[PDB]
Design a protein around this ligand. Sequence first.
Ligand SMILES: Nc1ncnc2c1ncn2[C@@H]1O[C@H](COP(=O)(O)OP(=O)(O)O)[C@@H](O)[C@H]1O
Ligand SMILES: O=C(O)CCCC[C@@H]1SC[C@@H]2NC(=O)N[C@@H]21
Ligand SMILES: [Mg+2]
Length: 444
Amino acid sequence: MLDKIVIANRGEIALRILRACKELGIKTVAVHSSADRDLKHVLLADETVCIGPAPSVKSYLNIPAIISAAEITGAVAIHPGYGFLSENANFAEQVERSGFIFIGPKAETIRLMGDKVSAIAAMKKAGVPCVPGSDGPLGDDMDKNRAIAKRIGYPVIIKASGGGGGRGMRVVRGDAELAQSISMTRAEAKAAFSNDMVYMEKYLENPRHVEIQVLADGQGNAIYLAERDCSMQRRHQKVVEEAPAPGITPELRRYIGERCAKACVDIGYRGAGTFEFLFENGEFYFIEMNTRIQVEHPVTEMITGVDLIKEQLRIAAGQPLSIKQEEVHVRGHAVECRINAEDPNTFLPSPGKITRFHAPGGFGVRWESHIYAGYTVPPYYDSMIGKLICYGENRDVAIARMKNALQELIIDGIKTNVDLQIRIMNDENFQHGGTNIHYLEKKL
Ligand SMILES: Nc1ncnc2c1ncn2[C@@H]1O[C@H](COP(=O)(O)OP(=O)(O)O)[C@@H](O)[C@H]1O
Ligand SMILES: O=C(O)CCCC[C@@H]1SC[C@@H]2NC(=O)N[C@@H]21
Ligand SMILES: [Mg+2]
């Protein structure tokens, strides 16, 4: 095992990683911004280094500061978690160049799958089903460009090739009105992620978001660990996730799973990753791969027994996969509710001091959060402050337990989305299962 690692993240995921490290006897170095001195994982870590002031650009995105901390503490590896630099290929390259293990894929794999156009091209070659689309960047030649939309059918979506948020997304329905429809997306794309390149694919109108968890050792072994349904979304951000996806048969699971594990071998993937699909009329359509741990990884852990972070660490240490495909079994069902420090109706972020806190407990109840009473949620970072995960022998049991756990959870002093989550668990269509990616915003 790795002697000592830097956790190059914060909040709940930093704590999640610290726990895995402690279990495996790996020493921890918590690097943190000056605003994050009081983070639970910082207080639990073996060593701590303040890497800069509060803004992410000066701390968690500060490559030289993170490397320097890893060097001075004598760490051998860096776990980037999710967000921040986890899918920054230049960071992964630099970490390895500086002589460290990067707990993630090779930098070239990150680049391959981080550019949507090269990603889709790689997936088609591997035999992963994709959304019929432009299969390349968009050009001003409307005589062949606007013929792309006709070939596939309307509506269509304009997506940024370096996009990953509420920017670089544009819904186009009109045939003639496309001589300036590509303008709105390109402006936002260079305004956000400094890359104007955009592509076109079919806007699927009744799809679910179904994604496949993979693990690969980078030695030729690759497994899939069932699927998750993450269809409950607001502004394209997931709110509720569950595993396995309702209605997905063992045969559909193996069909898509086998293709994802083959794609891993084909691209030389190393570590944890997730293939995201739109699922409509019994067909999967690849949209993107997250080349990192997934936020909602706990629901997969609950239904498979596989500790995904510990697996990332064993892989990073050069161990071949400890698990054969035949040994991956889906048992029971799990639901995750993201807990966000934001207003449950207007969604104004709600940073501030938590004056009273009580975590839910019980059989099948899992609570993933750094928050504690007296802790101040800083304004500088993403609003997700915790994740509540409930497991049961079936989906109805998991939901029942979630309803109860959400009622037990106390977070006073700030607004949270707990009231929204309660509403979702209470929604009759959610309870039936199979609601599409447009449902939550329609409900709201
Ligand atoms: N072709 C599409 N048709 C309809 N909705 C889409 C399409 N592509 C993406 N979306 C919506 O955007 C979400 C995120 O898409 P994704 O390609 O993963 O972008 P990001 O990098 O921002 O996560 C999806 O879960 C889905 O709700
Ligand atoms: O505070 C931050 O900015 C770090 C976490 C950011 C959220 C990341 S972005 C990738 C992943 N997907 C999500 O829906 N949330 C995390
Ligand atoms: Mg995505």
